[PDB]
């Protein structure tokens, strides 16, 4: 009932990993930070996926395949099994950088042998290897053809993590943009990179190259779980247009606010047990006198202005509105312009896909998607997940991409939900109208603080601060503190790790560019507090 | 802010009980039903509003200063179920008879004394009267045309009321030979011509307003920090908010009075109330148990400080339509806290609209709360032909999802329809075309909820059934496209369906 997966993290711990470039944390500390981030999510989220850890270039050989002189300086620190706190504690402080250097492809072979032996009996749905190296070490091209063949036959996916990104000044880890020294790369690193590129292309085609990340960017993304992320649970319905016309669909939640999975159980400070604490509800009169009111004598009531009318839950269930329970019923069609994004309601976005293994419904839905797209129109629909759920009215707009095709449902508001207030006009506020110098100062501010650059010459604007790619800092901050308390109970909570601040702040180039226009607008725009 | 005061003044002269248009209710019946409709609408839109019902031209006089022929049926007070029940005793022809029996009709009155009593009714209110309004329901276009003194004194007192701050609105009803404003009511009313039929305004008054509308509430007043030194103050307003079913109140079986609930936490071993210092929070993962104090659980929660932090300016094209997380907010400046905020806000709005770019910020609503990236989309002011602000000027705070909030998608094989099927779906869309309004649909659960409470309050056995607007007009749709529907169904679905 759950997506399982065998993950083997292959970390370079060689002396050169300890070799650090000024200002920048050593690739050893960078890889350690990324690995800890991954294991932390798998540990605290309690995923039933098994994780193994192989280190290459450590002093000595835990002989995982070292039948002779082969695969030296490779230690299998953790065999494929569910991750625990002992593993996190080992990563945090026990694992130290080694002095030797190993062949990253040899380490990849050790990882592959772990997957080949510990996955027996279709226990795992997905197989994945994550290599963490700097490529500064020399290597042999001897079994690359076999490595690729064994990876395909075993259906194992790869992911590479280097200190530099595929593409100077100060450098801040997790920041956007300058997150790797432009100069400093060795010809040995270039050669290793060319081999990495070829291997990724041989496994996942042209788009395989997108799976080669830098430690910095890896920290401000969820790409490390990409291959082991469990697919979202979809549910079926019928899009009913009128009478006689219908379409078998299956919709899932496209966007949904990810919240804390674990709940805080209240325990006693001394015993640390739930059993000792109990909450009892007491009834007392609303009136100045709080004599105890009998729990059984309490009757349900509702207010009708001044009057308070007693309406029991029994009569409520009978007299209440009974929903027809029909889901995704189409009410009508209107132009795209009539539905404004400001009226979107709810806490979810639904992606209405065509029922799986159904060709007639797939074409029936595709026809509507393309008809709405070509006419530049949308569909006003009635939706309810069950007869018990309150009915909703929302927008269903087309969404065609090169790979997939679907309709996107977003709940719209009811007359009662809408709120009409009157705000003072500013267009013609004689008192607040800004001068030409003030407007050209804001003009310089917006131009200097722009978060988008257009790649090539006229190509599409490349966004420099994609927030939708940055993970919610709540989770990795919580995992940091939870682990610190589990390992260091005597010590108080640690401060927010700097890379979290670096990933949340805009690229250094934007902050530096804004310096001058911000200083001009400070003097041009007078600010004083009201007291 | 304020509680609004509304006084319904009804004429009780002989002319009011004769209906003009045959087979039509008397102007009095129209008034009584209109008043009742307003009372019910008010028990939904705003319960704190104070209403009053005053009659004039009646033989029996009941009023503060004992002015002849003025019967104050209802003093200024909140709307109630029994007040509507009292008005229902005059609704209809039989109710008209009940009115003539309880109190007289067609008696000589004096509009000067009538407005004085109404003003004296506002005098006796203690709470903030935000709006003072009198709605005069009458079908006599020239009442004291015969008496010159009563007419001039009434004109003088009407001026005194407007100088007080009282609004005077006329609800002119059907009069033989038309209703003339120029003769009377033209100068008294607070600001057309001949209006022989009942004031059109009656259709709106008569129409029930089942809406839970609330006085403007700034949700929060935060600091918009452009930079460490540049900080303006802005107000965050929720212009759209899902209206939900009011929570029930726990009463008593006999007295039917509200009961206050106190949810107390105490020990099992000891039995006495436990202090919050003696409590700790725990989370157990497998075998390990992590212990954190309530303060520590909030300290990890702190993250960014409360306020808006300007990140930069992202072009609107980059903001995707499918990236909605939670309902958008409205950002407007708050000159009350920081003086000069509105000027910079106006300059920012103007230049953002010019450049078609949104202001990216790091939103932290309260202390010890993790931040969220929001995009302030420049919203321009829009005024209709009536000079009504259809879209206020400011920024729409659009919540952007984090990597966690974007859910992975189930990879499906792309199967594209033939141009014949899409052009044909185009024909269905073209035929089912309609005009969308933001206020087109009403919540059927709420509409039924308040219709049920109204009917139970009026002791009406039959509950008032709201027609569900959310259901599609199936039969109308089948009438508009029957054959086309069978044709496409034939084109895409084969007869051996699953």
């Amino acid at each position: 009932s759950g997506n399982k997966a065998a993950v083997v993290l292959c970390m370079d711990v060689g002396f050169t990993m300890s070799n650090s470039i000024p200002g920048i944390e050593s690739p050893f500390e960078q890889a350690k930070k990324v690995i800890t981030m991954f294991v932390q999510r798998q540990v605290f989220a309690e995923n039933k996926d098994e994780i193994a850890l192989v280190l290459f270039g450590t002093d000595g050989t835990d002989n995982p395949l070292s039948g002779g002189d082969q695969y030296q300086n490779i230690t299998v620190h953790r065999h494929l099994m569910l991750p625990d706190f002992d593993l996190l504690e080992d990563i945090e402080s026990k694992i130290q950088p080694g002095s030797q250097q190993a062949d990253f492809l040899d380490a990849l072979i050790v990882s592959m042998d772990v997957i080949q032996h510990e996955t027996i009996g279709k226990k795992f749905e997905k197989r994945h290897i994550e290599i963490f190296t700097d490529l500064s070490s020399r290597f042999s091209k001897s079994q690359l053809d076999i490595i690729i063949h064994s990876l395909k036959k075993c259906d194992i996916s790869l992911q590479f993590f280097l200190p530099f990104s595929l593409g100077d000044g100060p450098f801040r880890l997790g920041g956007h943009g300058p997150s790797f020294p432009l100069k400093g790369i060795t010809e040995q690193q270039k050669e290793g990179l060319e081999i990495v590129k070829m291997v990724m292309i041989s496994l996942e085609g042209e788009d395989g190259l997108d799976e080669i990340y830098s430690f910095s960017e890896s920290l401000r993304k969820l790409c490390v779980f990409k291959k082991i992320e469990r697919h979202s649970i979809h549910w079926p319905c019928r899009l009913t247009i009128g009478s006689n016309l219908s379409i078998r669909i299956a919709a899932y939640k496209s966007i949904l606010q990810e919240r804390v999975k674990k709940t805080w159980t209240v325990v006693d400070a001394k015993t640390l047990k739930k059993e000792d604490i109990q909450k009892e509800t007491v009834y007392c009169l609303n009136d100045d006198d709080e004599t105890e009111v009998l729990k059984e004598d309490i009757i349900q009531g509702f207010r009708y202005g001044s009057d308070i009318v007693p309406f029991s839950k029994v009569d409520e269930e009978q007299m209440k509105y009974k929903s027809e329970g029909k889901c995704f019923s189409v009410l009508g069609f209107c132009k795209s312009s009539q539905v404004q994004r400001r009226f979107f309601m709810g806490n979810q976005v639904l992606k209405v896909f065509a029922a799986r293994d159904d060709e007639a419904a797939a074409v029936a839905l595709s026809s509507l998607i393309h008809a709405l797209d070509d006419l530049d129109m949308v569909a006003i629909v009635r939706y309810a997940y069950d007869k018990r759920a309150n009915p909703q009215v929302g927008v269903a707009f087309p969404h065609i991409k090169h790979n997939y095709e679907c309709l996107v449902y977003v709940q719209l508001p009811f007359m009662e939900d809408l709120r009409q207030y009157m705000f003072s006009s500013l267009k013609n506020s004689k008192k607040y109208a800004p001068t030409e110098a003030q407007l050209n100062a804001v003009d310089a501010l917006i131009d200097s603080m722009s978060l988008a650059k257009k790649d090539e010459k006229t190509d599409t604007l490349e966004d420099l601060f994609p927030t939708t790619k940055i993970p919610n800092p709540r989770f990795q901050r919580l995992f940091q503190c939870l682990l610190h308390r589990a390992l260091h109970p005597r010590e108080p909570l640690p401060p927010i790790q700097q890379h979290i601040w670096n990933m949340l702040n805009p690229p250094a180039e934007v902050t530096t560019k804004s310096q001058i226009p911000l200083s001009k607008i400070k003097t041009l725009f007078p600010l004083i507090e009201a007291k | 802010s304020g509680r609004d005061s509304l006084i319904f003044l009804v004429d009780a002269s002989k002319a009011m009980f004769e209906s003009q248009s045959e087979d039509e209710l008397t102007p009095f019946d129209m008034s009584i039903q209109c008043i009742q409709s307003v009372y019910i609408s008010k028990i939904i839109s705003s319960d704190r509003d104070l209403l009053a019902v005053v009659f004039y031209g009646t033989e029996k006089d009941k009023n503060s200063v004992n002015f002849k022929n003025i019967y104050v049926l209802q003093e200024l007070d909140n709307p109630g179920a029994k007040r509507i029940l009292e008005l229902d005793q005059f609704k209809g022809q039989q109710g008209q008879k009940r009115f003539q029996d309880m109190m007289g009709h067609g008696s000589d009155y004096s509009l000067s004394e009538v407005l004085w009593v109404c003003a004296n009714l506002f005098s006796d209110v203690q709470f903030k009267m935000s709006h003072k309004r009198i709605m005069l329901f009458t079908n006599e276009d020239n009442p004291h045309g015969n008496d010159s003194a009563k007419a001039s004194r009434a004109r003088t007192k009407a001026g005194d009321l407007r100088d007080t701050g009282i609004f005077l609105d006329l609800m002119h009803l059907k009069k033989p030979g038309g209703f003339d404003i120029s003769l009377f009511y033209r100068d008294i009313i607070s600001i057309l011509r001949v209006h022989f039929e009942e004031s059109s305004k009656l259709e709106d008054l008569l129409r029930k307003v089942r809406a839970k509308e609330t006085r403007k509430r700034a949700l929060s007043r935060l600091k918009l920090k452009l930079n460490k030194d540049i900080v303006i103050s802005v107000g965050i307003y929720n212009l759209v908010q899902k209206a939900l079913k009011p929570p029930p109140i726990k009463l008593y079986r006999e007295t039917n009075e509200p009961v206050k609930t106190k949810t107390r936490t105490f020990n099992t071993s000891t039995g006495g109330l436990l202090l919050p210092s003696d409590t700790k929070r725990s989370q157990i993962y497998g075998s390990r148990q992590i212990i954190l104090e309530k303060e520590e659980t909030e300290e990890l929660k702190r993250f960014d400080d409360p306020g808006l932090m300007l990140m930069g300016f992202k072009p609107l094209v980059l903001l995707k339509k499918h990236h909605y997380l939670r309902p958008s907010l409205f950002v407007y400046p708050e000159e009350s806290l920081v003086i000069g905020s509105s000027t910079l806000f106006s300059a920012l709005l103007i230049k953002c609209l010019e450049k078609e770019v949104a202001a990216l910020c790091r939103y932290t609503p309260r202390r010890n709360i993790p931040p969220y990236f929001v995009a302030l989309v420049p919203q321009e002011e829009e005024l209709d032909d009536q000079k009504i602000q259809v879209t206020p000027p400011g920024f729409q705070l659009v919540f952007l999802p984090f990597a966690d909030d974007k859910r992975k998608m189930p990879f499906t094989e792309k199967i594209m329809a033939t141009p014949e099927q899409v052009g044909k779906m185009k024909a269905i869309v073209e035929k089912l075309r309609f005009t969308y309004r933001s206020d087109s649909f009403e919540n059927p659960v709420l509409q039924q909820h308040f219709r049920n409470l109204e009917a139970l309050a009026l002791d009406l056995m039959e509950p008032e059934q709201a027609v569900d607007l959310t259901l599609p007009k199936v039969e109308a749709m089948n009438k508009r496209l029957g054959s086309l529907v069978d044709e496409f169904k034939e084109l895409v679905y084969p007869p051996d369906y699953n």
């Binding site: 009157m422 | 705003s46 129409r207 109308a476």
Partner: peptide, 28 residues
């Protein structure tokens, strides 16, 4: 400051609106 109810009718500062809609069809 500025405080015009305008076309708010019974609820000042609150625009009044038609309750109907959803079945008005243009005849293509």
């Amino acid at each position: 400051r500025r405080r015009c109810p305008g076309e708010s009718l019974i609820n000042p500062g609150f625009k009044s609106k038609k309750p109907a809609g959803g079945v008005d069809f243009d005849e293509t």
